[PDB]
Amino acid sequence: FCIDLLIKLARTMNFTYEVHLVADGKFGTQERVNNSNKKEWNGMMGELLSGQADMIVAPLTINNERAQYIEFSKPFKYQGLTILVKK
Amino acid sequence: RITGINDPRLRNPSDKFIYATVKQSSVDIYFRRQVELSTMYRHMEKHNYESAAEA
Amino acid sequence: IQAVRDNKLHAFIWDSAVLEFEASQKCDLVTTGELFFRSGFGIGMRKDSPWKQNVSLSILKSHENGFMEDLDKTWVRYQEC
Amino acid sequence: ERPFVIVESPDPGTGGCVPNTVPCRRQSNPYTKLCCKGFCIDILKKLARVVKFSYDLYLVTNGKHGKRVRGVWNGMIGEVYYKRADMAIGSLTINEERSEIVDFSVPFVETGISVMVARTVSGLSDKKFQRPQDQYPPFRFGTVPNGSTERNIRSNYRDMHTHMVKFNQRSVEDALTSLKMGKLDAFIYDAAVLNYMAGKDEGCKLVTIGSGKVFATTGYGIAMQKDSHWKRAIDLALLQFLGDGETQKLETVWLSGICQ
Ligand SMILES: *[C@@H]1O[C@H](CO)[C@@H](O[C@@H]2O[C@H](CO)[C@@H](O)[C@H](O)[C@H]2NC(C)=O)[C@H](O)[C@H]1NC(C)=O
Ligand SMILES: *[C@@H]1O[C@H](CO)[C@@H](O[C@@H]2O[C@H](CO)[C@@H](O)[C@H](O)[C@H]2NC(C)=O)[C@H](O)[C@H]1NC(C)=O
Structure with missing residues (x-):
């Protein structure tokens, strides 16, 4: 989905893109170790934030903490959270 | 037959069902000091039997 | 998903879209209830870069013409078998 | 707007209106004092209490919302554009057309475009609204003019516009009156207001399949003059308002349904 959207976006703004996966697979929260x-x-x-990346294209959340440091864009699909049980 | 204070019939008063209490009671103060429930007082002040077991 | 399907865990708490598609995708799994929180996805970059404003305009541009809706229908409609 | 911002006549004799209300002043540019209360009223009250700002409530006279007819902006959007008003609040959607010149905040109410009918159509692409030239003429979808939907139907099905010159053209309630009578069976309008009004009615009128077929999924926002720093602040606060379940409470104290 997201990569097709990326193609449709890059076809309009003279883009050249290099895509690479994350290092560890964790989405990401604030983390503080002792000292x-x-x-x-x-x-x-x-x-x-480090500088290796230039833009993130993934189903990310818009919680309050993330908007403190990074400016987002207008959302493209609203949704919620739910529970899965075997049935 | 009925329910507690959750039904939309009480959240939005209906012309069919009538909710009334005893006037000049502690419940009058209780419904006269709630922010969200204020509108129910608007219904309650409209018609409530200023009465007793007669009501 | 594999662990809870193998009955190692009982229920999984996760975003509505992913499970809403996967339940219809694999087999035998359905979700119960509805959302208790509501938010959407979006694009994120460093502060104060014009790409942000331009893609923000372009996203609504695409939403107006149904491109996003058409793509979503194409990629989730062949399910619920 | 009918459910969101409600305007009422002042107190019986005093002038300071009933509590849980905010004084508002309609201008003529007789500045009578009215009292306004509703969803956006409490939203703005909480926002001002949390960011420590003061405000006054002013209404508009030139049109309801306003469109760029003849290259001139009327309505709230025009008022914000001409810098005669620093902010706009209430029922105002988001789209590419308005976003060119005016900033916006994070949406807080997920809106849409839906079809109100009686108690037959399953999309824009359906043969009914796509090429309405069949034997049975399904007539008079509402689509209140000069609002937020005509620009949307301007480039979604280009032939629907010229077929759609005659309809219910008084208000949202006029569409309900005509539906109850039977002069029309089609209505197309915003999802939130239609859902709220279909919630509370004698018997109940069934909207189409539901939110699963809403077109142009967007969210209600807050307009403001461009480059204002203030924006950033309120943006953060808005997200916090979704955290404490404030939206759920402020909706359940302003939204309900006898059937929906
Ligand atoms: C962002 O999109 C806009 C619209 O195409 C462009 O930005 C400028 O837009 C003005 C008004 O149309 C033009 O006069 C400028 O020439 C545009 N700038 C550039 C660099 O083209 C542009 O296409 C996009 N990028 C930027 C940086 O604005
Ligand atoms: C959309 O624009 C039309 C055209 O200006 C508005 O219709 C006008 O309404 C005034 C009201 O007194 C009449 O004097 C004009 O003769 C009307 N013009 C036409 C061409 O019908 C219409 O009111 C606007 N929509 C809204 C919601 O205000």
């Missing part, structure tokens, strides 16, 4: 009170970022959000 370091600042909750340093880890995940693809931390990779983007």
Whole structure:
């Protein structure tokens, strides 16, 4: 889905793209280890903040904490959360 | 037959069902000091038997 | 998904779209209830870069003409077998 | 707007209206004082209480929402454009046309475009609304003019427009009156207002399949003059408002249904 959307987007703004997967597979939250009170970022959000990335294209969430440091765009699909049980 | 204070018939008063209490009671103050429930007082103040077991 | 399907766990708490497609996709699994939180996906980049504004306009541009809806229908409609 | 922002006549004799309300002033540019309360009213009250700002409520006279007819903007969008009003609140959708010149915040109410009918169509591509030239003439979809939907139907099915010159053209309630009578069976309008009004009615009128077929899925936002720093602040706050379940409470104290 997202890569097809990326193709349709790049066909309009003179783009050249290099796509590469995340390092560890974790989505990303603030993380603070002892002797370091600042909750340093880890995940693809931390990779983007580091400088290796230029844009993230994945089904990311728009929770309050993420918007503090990174400017988002208008959402393209609203949804919620649900529970899965065997039946 | 009926339910607690959750039904839309009480959230939105209906012309068929009538909700009334005893006037000049502690319940009057209780419904006169709730922010969200204020509108029910609007119904309750409209018609409530200023009465007793007669009601 | 594999663990809870193998009855190692009982229920999985996850986003509505992923499970809503996968339940109709694999077999025998259905979700119960509805959302208790509501939000959507989006694109994210570093602060103050014009790509952000331009793609934000382009996303609504695509939404107006049904391109996103058509793509979603194409990629989720062949399910619920 | 009918469910969101409600305007009422002042208190019986005093002038300071009933509590849980905010004074508002309709201008003529007799500045009578009315009292406004509703969903957006409480939203703005909480926002101002959390970001420590003061405000006054002013209505508009030139049209309901406003369109770019003859290259001039009327309505709330035009008022914000001409810098005669720093902010706009209430029923105002989001799309590419308005986003060119005016900023916007994160949406807080997921809206859509749906079809109200009586108690037959399953999409825009359906043969009924696509090429309406069959034997039975299904007539008079509502689509209140000069609003938020005509620009959307301007480039979704180009032949539907010229077939759609005659309809119910008084208000949203006029469509309900005509549906109850039977002069028409088609209505197309915003999802939120239609859902709310179909919620509370004697008997109940059944909308189409539901939110599963909404066109142009967007969200209601807050307009504001461009480059204002203020925007960023409120944006963050808006997300926090979705965290504490505030939206659920402020909806359940303003949304319900006798059938829906
Ligand atoms: C972003 O999209 C706009 C629209 O195509 C462009 O930005 C500028 O838009 C103005 C008004 O149309 C033009 O006069 C400028 O020439 C555009 N800038 C450039 C660099 O083309 C542009 O296509 C996109 N990029 C930027 C950086 O604006
Ligand atoms: C959309 O635009 C039309 C055209 O201006 C508006 O219709 C006009 O309404 C005024 C009201 O007094 C009449 O004097 C004009 O003769 C009407 N013009 C036409 C061409 O019918 C219409 O009101 C606008 N829509 C809304 C919702 O305001």
